[PDB]
Design a protein around this ligand. Structure first.
Ligand code: HC1
Ligand code: SF4
Ligand code: SF4
Ligand code: SF4
Ligand code: SF4
Ligand code: FES
Length: 574
């Protein structure tokens, strides 16, 4: 047993771990900043975690392992001086702009300003922010005035995607972060997933705003503005209203959206039942001899870009069905003008996503028909959260309401989409039903569920064995392919998500604060909201959705054929 005494207080312990980790578990207050995702900034560390080890001196706690017979000083004198020295070097390449900063209510640096009574030697006040600002991307923006180059985005991009698209760059003898050759992220191998935003402690990395598009549509007299939220939104935005974690707020969001002035309150889970409608039929048609195989999902835009950039040979194997966002959006300007005698031209479609990559997808040139965009705007979870807050609508005290039915109803299959293995379980519910022409009772595919990186399963369809895999996160796609696991058998259907945990851990999601990030399993608790909705739902198959069935009978006519084949699909060729 190792005996350590941190600040006159004794602890006996056997675990070999760092001083920050042990002082995190036993509620002691060592402050950290560049440490995240099991790694600090290896090249020029921040030292906000400096402690004193007797005889040795001031060391960085985030990577100094505990030894038997230590005496450690954290709230010390010499230690607190070295940390404020570091804080008044970073708060010197930053501006006190907390209102109107998008990060003031949950910053991390602002917390450590008032904690240490951190003062700037000279206030950093650039006359022109243009050199620091990058708004060229459809998904990501950078404001280097706020960057305290901790390296967390570079590390998170390396651990989560292994693309290393977020790099440390040298610009005129100085170090900045950005894409390769300081290009716009969109023009590099970046998947636009937004995990770098999720690891950023400040306002430096942010999503490209689409809420000026939204407010102008709401104020435009002729425009009939439709909104629809992604599966993961109802499972997470309540964190931004101090409601906690794993809180189902579906009904409160529908009310809130009506108080913001939206004309129709629909839901992307209806579009998720549409995507399974097309994709499960295509899978049954591919099983009719070859297809080819494997069929891959095409609903994660982060993954589509990974395929386009690293595996262009797989772009043909990708499912023709549009993503829920895009397929809902195509129906927004065609089926929804049919009922409600409106001109397609005057309908404006807004989606609320846990994703930054969705903004690139919606803005793709060919995601339109006859000049009308499938989706006109995509605000993230965080952006809808600010809309609600600016309007002072009291989210947590709100009464529940339902969505307008025609394009707002959803089944349990569409509900679990926001979690990893969600699209796989939903597709297999309709694919085994279609191929066997039966209403099967056994619908749970628990073996493709969960937080494992690579999950496989053998499903039986028409007394024949098929192999399916679920790739949880873009780094694991690289592992899948490069290791040759892809060749250990003939795979028939493969789900790929770019974010680990699925869309519930997407790039446009609420930031967590590392104290709560150590105690809460975010991916598990956000996803449990979705699965619990599936369990209590009476319809748990996409083709059983009553509103979906009559769109297809009165307007598209049969999945994967004629009208449904011509406008509800998209194939990538580069
Ligand atoms: O963002 C995201 Fe997602 O795999 C989530 O939540 S799950 Fe999706 O197929 C789509 O489109 C669906 O439905 S991608 C969301 O909206
Ligand atoms: S990034 Fe944080 S400390 Fe900096 S201006 Fe914004 S809220 Fe203030
Ligand atoms: S953009 Fe954010 S996460 Fe990346 S190095 Fe700068 S402050 Fe750190
Ligand atoms: S959006 Fe994703 S792939 Fe692009 S730099 Fe950020 S973490 Fe890397
Ligand atoms: S997993 Fe979801 S949130 Fe992440 S890039 Fe893909 S669609 Fe976006
Ligand atoms: S948190 Fe330890 S050197 Fe940055």
């Amino acid at each position: 047993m190792k005996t350590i005494i941190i600040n006159g207080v004794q602890f006996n312990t056997d675990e070999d771990t760092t001083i920050l980790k042990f002082a995190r578990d036993n509620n002691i207050d060592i402050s950290a900043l560049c440490f995240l995702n099991n790694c600090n900034n290896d090249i020029n560390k921040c030292e906000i975690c400096t402690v004193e080890v007797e005889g040795t001196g001031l060391v960085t706690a985030c990577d100094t392992l505990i030894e038997d017979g230590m005496i450690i000083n954290t709230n010390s004198d010499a230690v607190n001086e070295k940390i404020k020295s570091r804080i008044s070097q970073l708060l010197d390449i930053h501006e006190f702009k907390c209102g109107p900063c998008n990060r003031r209510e949950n910053c991390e640096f602002l917390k450590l300003v008032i904690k240490y009574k951190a003062r700037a030697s000279k206030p950093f006040l650039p006359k022109d922010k243009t050199e620091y600002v990058d708004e060229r991307s459809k998904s990501l923006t950078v404001d280097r005035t706020k960057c305290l180059l901790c390296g967390r985005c570079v590390n998170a991009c390396g651990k989560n995607t292994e693309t290393y698209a977020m790099k440390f760059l040298n610009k005129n003898g100085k170090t900045i972060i950005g894409a390769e050759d300081e290009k716009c992220f969109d023009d590099t191998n970046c998947l636009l997933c937004g995990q770098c935003i999720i690891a950023c402690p400040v306002a430096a990395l942010s999503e490209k705003s689409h809420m000026d598009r939204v407010k102008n549509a709401l104020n435009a007299p002729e425009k009939h503005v439709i909104v629809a939220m992604a599966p993961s939104v109802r499972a997470s935005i309540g964190e931004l209203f101090n409601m906690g974690f794993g809180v189902d707020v579906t009904g409160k969001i529908y009310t809130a959206l009506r108080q913001l002035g939206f004309d129709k309150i629909f839901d992307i889970n209806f579009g998720a039942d549409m995507t399974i409608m097309e994709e499960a039929t295509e899978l049954v048609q591919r099983i009719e001899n070859n297809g080819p195989f494997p069929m891959f999902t095409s609903c994660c835009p982060g993954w589509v870009r990974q395929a386009e950039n690293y595996y262009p040979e797989l772009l043909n194997n990708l499912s023709s069905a549009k993503s829920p966002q895009q397929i809902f959006g195509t129906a927004s300007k065609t089926y929804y003008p049919s009922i409600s005698g409106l001109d397609p031209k005057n309908v404006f479609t807004v989606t609320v996503m846990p994703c930054t990559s969705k903004k690139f997808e919606a803005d793709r040139p060919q995601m339109e028909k006859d000049g009308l965009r499938d989706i006109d705007a995509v605000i993230t979870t965080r952006e809808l959260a600010k809309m609600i807050k600016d309007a002072k609508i009291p989210f947590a005290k709100l009464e529940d309401s339902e969505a307008d039915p025609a394009m707002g109803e959803y089944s349990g299959a569409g509900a679990i989409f926001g979690a990893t293995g969600g699209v796989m379980e939903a597709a297999l519910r309709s694919a085994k039903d279609f191929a066997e022409n039966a209403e099967l009772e056994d619908i749970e595919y628990k073996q493709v569920r969960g937080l494992n990186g690579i999950k496989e399963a053998e499903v039986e369809i028409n007394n024949n064995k098929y192999n399916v895999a679920v790739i949880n996160g873009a780094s694991n796609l690289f592992k899948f392919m490069k290791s040759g696991m892809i060749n250990e058998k003939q795979y028939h259907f493969i789900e790929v998500m770019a974010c680990h945990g699925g869309c519930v851990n997407g790039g446009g999601q609420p930031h967590v604060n590392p104290k709560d990030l150590e105690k809460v399993d975010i991916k598990k608790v956000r996803a449990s909201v979705l699965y619990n909705q599936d369990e209590h739902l009476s319809k748990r198959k996409s083709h059983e959705n009553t509103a979906l069935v009559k769109m297809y009978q009165n307007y598209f006519g049969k999945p994967g054929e004629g009208r449904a084949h011509e406008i509800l699909h998209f194939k990538y060729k580069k």
